[PDB]
């Protein structure tokens, strides 16, 4: 893993333990690489304990810069 992606779109979902919390512009460190449908990643946080593992579609993220 150790792959990093940028959030082009936001992802916010509550009442779901597998949901990820990310805002557009933030970076996610994914343990997955070349997934199918959706993958699990870790939010790049400064405070330990913040957003551990969440599932999200690779369609809303990319490693390169935006427009």
For 49, the domain range is: 1-67
- Spatial contact of 39 and 58, defined as CB atoms under 8 Å apart: yes
What are the C-alpha distances in Å from 44 to residues 5, 24, 48? 10, 13, 10
Question: What is d(CA 39, CA 23) in angstroms, rounded to the nearest whole number?
Answer: 17
Beta-bridged to residue 28, according to DSSP, are: 5, 43
Start-to-end C-alpha separation, the chain:
26
Instruction: Give 64's strand partners.
Output: none
For the chain, the domain total comes to 1
CATH number for the domain spanning 53: value is: 2.30.30.40
């Amino acid at each position: 893993g150790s792959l990093k992606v940028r959030a082009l779109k936001d992802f916010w979902n509550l009442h779901d333990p597998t949901a990820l919390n990310v805002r557009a512009g933030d970076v996610i460190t994914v343990l997955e690489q070349h997934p199918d449908g959706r993958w699990k990643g870790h939010i790049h946080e400064s405070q330990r304990g913040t957003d551990r593992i969440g599932y999200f579609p690779p369609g809303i993220v990319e490693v390169v810069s935006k427009r």
